[PDB]
Write a protein that binds this ligand. Structure first.
Ligand SMILES: [Mg+2]
Ligand SMILES: [Mg+2]
Ligand SMILES: [Mg+2]
Ligand SMILES: [Mg+2]
Ligand SMILES: [Mg+2]
Ligand SMILES: [Mg+2]
Lengths: 536, 534, 534
């Protein structure tokens, strides 16, 4: 099993759908029984995305193993079965980070450390390390062919190709092909110029995925093929679709996989896109429609909630419900009232950090609870839910979490190390990654999940204060799931509501269009049910 | 009078509307009382545009001086009052052609002839020659930056700038700023890559014209302004508009002219855009509408009849009528018959060459003439009508133009030389502006409200004077003539609401601001018809 | 017979000796029994090299077929046996000139003519035409990579390679590898930058010829091989040698041909360089030496007489004499007189045009003739002698060539047409190979050991036959003639040790391997003289 590489680059413009296109291609190949993987090389100095701001960067994906990563890894997982690890994503800064240590520590032997080969060498090592024992490895180069930031990545993959050879390496480049209103036509120039840059640095693309408003007409394609470029019938059209679930099919329709298998000398069964057609079908044929309110502090960048939004969609798939997501700002709530929340068949409070929109969230939770509106809260969203209750259904006077009010009488949520009493009494940090969790017999989730135990992914520090727990419990609230050790609280549920659950983890990083998510499926169904009784 | 030069280039993709944008800028400057001109440098080996196909290039504009040029000079002309000459358009081929010959006549003295400096020197010569004593000269460079084709032009203007200095030189570069439905955002990378191709060539742009499908936001702009670009507040947004007549105003609103004037140290009044405003108003507030059928052969590529279409639009303006142009292929008249002609308030038969739909046209002329439908025929459209007339009225069995049936007995159209008769009895090309005399009791005389007019020519075949009288007798009216050989220019059909046909190309003189008497009159009639006919 | 193409380009600087290096490689391949040719693509607008000045370009080589070409074809010819035709050299100007005309005759059908594909198509056509059925074709691209001038040629060959594929195409790129007296080391950066300019243009070199003043060390090489370059062991060192005759061996030692043959899948015997070895030996082991004065006008740029110099060198080879060429300006003969001629064992008066030193020459001829100094005159050098002879012996007051004094009474040199007499009595250009008949009792007859020979021509002015007999009578010998008009080709001076003068350019046929009878004979004599004269 000689490992084969597909280096995926984009030209002309950013935001071309490269992540998704690699994902889709990976999907097809897997559908052919191949052992496939994908990796993301991010051309930025930040050592890890775990510090990038959601606005700008988008959401911070979390792998099983706790790596904080680029959201593209989210796309990968929702398209292929291979699990992502830290090995699947690295940035220009971690490389440098690396090379700078080895240096300042000898390794180089007073030799002069340069981009080439020291940096490039470091890139290859990591690329190999992640391709390690896969039939096909998709290497997605972030940024745009043409930026400097890209340079070292491109040079490294160039080196690889030479080394490894045409028989186990391919270059897949993505270009924009604008449609002209004025021209009333297809502009191929930009692709030519892009391919031109590849050549300028040693790279001759083997495949071209042409992104356009609409399908790129053979004639145009035929032009590109030869037009500079120089590919054969490996010029692919990637029109704008209304559903990403259709991409694997479109690419297949065009022979991309075949081209790829031949080149790689991969003898293998024809791709069966049944699951994808299924997903498409379901999506195309909803029965009912709901409107869900997503109440958070980062709505400027919807990509800040990428995984949630996809999860909601999946939940809809599993119920034949067309979900209408209405993005709402924690703030306005605690500003514009509560009349913004009205008209939601359901309400979701995602994660985030601060204290910023936090008050409006607490509110939202209360509104949901009080108005028997199905509510689902992730992390922050659980916390803001622990509160409202603590506050409104118990004593917990000004109930809060030390993230916001370090000195509260009632710190129902806060670092374990900070666990104190209402009387300041006391007892005798970053949770990242997949973690087992024990569900409470007789709980909603225990039913939804249909298992005693589950594994979910975390990304948090502030825990439920066990010190003020029973106090909230006895107020009626219920603990649905825990995480042994310190038995930390993972899931809570409010007993006298139609559908009210909250968890510490990010159920969203486990949802997929093909298999859904028990929690989201439930939530969505409930939303439906709610819609149904509100009028009938 | 130190001449000032504005070098206009384009990046990313072709078709950014660079010609119109240059025209519009010229329009502002002119509206500030400046003496302005514009020139088109086409990076193509064809020596003379007058040989290229419309499929590819679209209409052949004709200047006053008879030069055959790129359609862009038509745009220039519809935006500024400066007239175009053969000196406002030239190609790579002309340059090489020039150098080759100069070289063959030993002007170079055994020295090595090279792109640099021979070709570039030749280009510079032409530029200066064309900008000769104007306050501002806009030099539009054809082609797309980054291509091989335009290299010489770019090197040449680089030198000029360097020679002339930044006090009288500016580079204005158009670029595509795509819109991502996805991210819902605007991509400035292409601009950056494009701007960098200039640098690689030694040019650093002074102004950027950012073309998008919507306005480019100050955000995306200041980014451009600096990031990879380096211009001041010379980052201009040029969104897709619904009327090119809005452009000068749009550019003026963003201060382009001020920046321009400022750099060139031009102290002049603010741009008075009143005429443009009027045009804009008239266009937006039609009081009625019509459907004018445009019956021809190159009907496929629109640009083929750029100027005609524009002149019909101007006709609307003048009459506050909304003109619906129905592009009709003459072969289908041939094919399916006058069935297609049904539903028009007017019929226009344009010029062109190639027997092709020629029969399809004659028919149309007839149709129009026989159904009292207002008609306008230009050149071929006039010939096509002489025929119909001659035929169906003068009874001249298969009257024709030698151009298509040299053996015709009855050939009312033909070179002055081939001029024979039905009895075989007997006894170069027209280009550019020609005085023509209007006949005293003509419709056309009224419209133009003048004894003599000046129009543009581009034809060989003529009204066989040896047969004229026959048709005259048969009722036809000679509305105008050349003068000397007293060649027939215009003809009229008396028992008609509105039937005019001329040899010249009236469309080359139409302007949105001042319109055109024929077109005006023709549109009016189309209206009248419309109404009546209901 | 799938033709194989070797694209030869150059980077960093011009004058890397690219022509010689291509020739030498061709020489190896040929020595392996391959059918090989070479062509010169000159990126200059001059249509015909036959109009460029030597100041700039050096001698005008003349092919068998009469084509006037770049001196490089002379190099080609001195290294391979394949003969050159007009098809082995062409310029940018020829290409454009071709396209222009094709375009004017509507071959393009109104389509846009552009650099790509029209010009590039034209180039490809010529290349294929020139490589037509040879096993290997070396295509030398003139100019320096990275310049604008050579763009088209580079794009064209890029296409070919792409079209033809790597099985029959190779790119060979010459580059400068400077030596730093400082660090005492060798700089490979320029190679890298140069190699990268190719990439930017879409070409990735297969072989690098590293030119230095000393051999490039395996060290600096493997670095090149990979670092920024990417070729295999196609990194060749080409140090400055003392004899170009060593080159094929030097290249062969590094395995260039094997690599070449290998890539092209050519199965052929090892390069037999015996002839080269001999040449090398002869050159290194002269047994005596001489000083031959080369008396002329363009005396300044050496390359002006490339072939002559080479043929004199070959003369040495054949006689194991070391030839000391004394470049003597004819105006100084004019200026300072025969004083300068002192110290020569022989006198050579080359060809050329321009009255200039013409008098300086006639003198020389005389001097040589009157001091029994072996002489050789080519073309002008022959004319210059007819004169002297005619004059100082036939007593023809100021005999001359109309070329300089059209009004001369006594004009022994002139166009067949101007052919008059002293009494005014009476009754295009020669280029390329011409049969000439050798006179039975001539020296020249012995030397060539043949009745008829073939030589190359490049002249207009001729031996005025109406005056011949006079000079014949005065003692002069007609050693050879054209044939038909029985034009005088060669003349001899009987009371002389060695005095020959021909119209043709013997130098165009000289070769280091096979030498040249005239030159051989002439050098021999110079030796003899030398000795005697002491
Ligand atoms: Mg991506
Ligand atoms: Mg990235
Ligand atoms: Mg234009
Ligand atoms: Mg153009
Ligand atoms: Mg050379
Ligand atoms: Mg050259």
């Amino acid at each position: 099993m000689t490992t084969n590489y597909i280096f995926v680059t984009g030209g002309v413009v950013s935001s071309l759908g490269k992540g998704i296109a690699a994902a889709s291609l990976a999907a097809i190949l897997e559908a052919r029984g191949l052992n496939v993987t994908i990796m993301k090389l991010d051309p930025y100095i930040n050592v890890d995305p775990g510090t990038m701001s959601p606005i700008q960067h988008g959401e911070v994906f979390v792998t099983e193993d706790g790596a904080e990563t680029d959201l593209d890894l989210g796309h990968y997982e929702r398209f292929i079965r291979t699990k992502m690890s830290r090995r699947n994503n690295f940035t220009t800064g971690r490389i440098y980070s690396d090379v700078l240590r080895k240096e300042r520590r000898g390794d180089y032997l007073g030799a002069t450390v340069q981009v080439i080969p020291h940096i490039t060498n470091a890139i290859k090592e990591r690329v190999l390390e992640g391709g390690e024992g896969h039939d096909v490895v998709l290497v997605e180069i972030g940024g745009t062919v043409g930026d400097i930031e890209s340079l070292p990545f491109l040079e490294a993959i160039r080196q690889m190709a030479v080394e490894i050879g045409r028989e186990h390496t391919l270059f897949m480049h993505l270009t924009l092909v604008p449609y002209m209103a004025a021209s009333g036509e297809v502009k191929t120039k930009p692709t030519q110029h892009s391919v031109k840059e590849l050549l300028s640095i040693g790279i001759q693309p083997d495949i071209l995925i042409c992104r356009s408003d609409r399908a790129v007409p053979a004639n145009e394609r035929a032009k590109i093929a030869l037009f500079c470029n120089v590919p054969e019938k490996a010029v692919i059209s990637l029109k704008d679709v209304d559903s990403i679930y259709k991409i694997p099919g479109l690419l297949k329709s065009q022979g991309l996989d075949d081209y790829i298998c031949k080149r790689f000398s991969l003898n293998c069964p024809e791709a069966n896109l049944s699951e994808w057609e299924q997903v498409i079908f379901e999506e195309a044929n909803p029965v009912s429609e709901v409107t869900i309110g997503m109440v958070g502090k980062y709505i400027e960048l919807p990509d800040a909630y990428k995984s949630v939004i996809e999860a909601l969609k999946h939940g809809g798939l599993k119920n034949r419900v067309s979900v209408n997501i209405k993005l709402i700002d924690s703030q306005d709530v605690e500003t514009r009232g509560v009349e913004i929340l009205k008209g939601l068949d359901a309400i979701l409070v995602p994660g985030g950090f601060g204290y910023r929109g936090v008050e409006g969230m607490i509110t939202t939770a209360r509104f949901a609870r009080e108005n028997n509106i199905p509510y689902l809260g992730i992390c922050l969203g659980m916390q803001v839910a622990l509160i409202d209750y603590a506050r409104h259904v118990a004593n917990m006077e000004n109930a809060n979490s030390t993230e916001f009010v370090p000195d509260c009488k009632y710190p129902v949520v806060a670092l374990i190390t900070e666990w104190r009493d209402e009387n300041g009494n006391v007892e005798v940090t970053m949770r990242l990654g997949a973690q087992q969790c024990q569900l409470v017999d007789d709980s909603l989730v225990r039913q939804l999940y249909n298992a005693p135990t589950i594994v979910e992914r975390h990304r948090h520090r502030y825990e439920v204060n066990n010190m003020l727990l029973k106090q909230i419990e006895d107020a009626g609230l219920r603990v649905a799931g825990r995480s042994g050790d310190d038995q930390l609280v993972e899931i809570i549920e409010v007993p006298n509501h139609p559908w009210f659950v909250a968890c510490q983890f990010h159920p969203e990083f486990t949802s997929t269009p093909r298999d859904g998510h028990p929690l989201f499926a439930g939530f969505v169904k409930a939303a439906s049910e709610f819609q149904k009784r509100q009028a009938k």
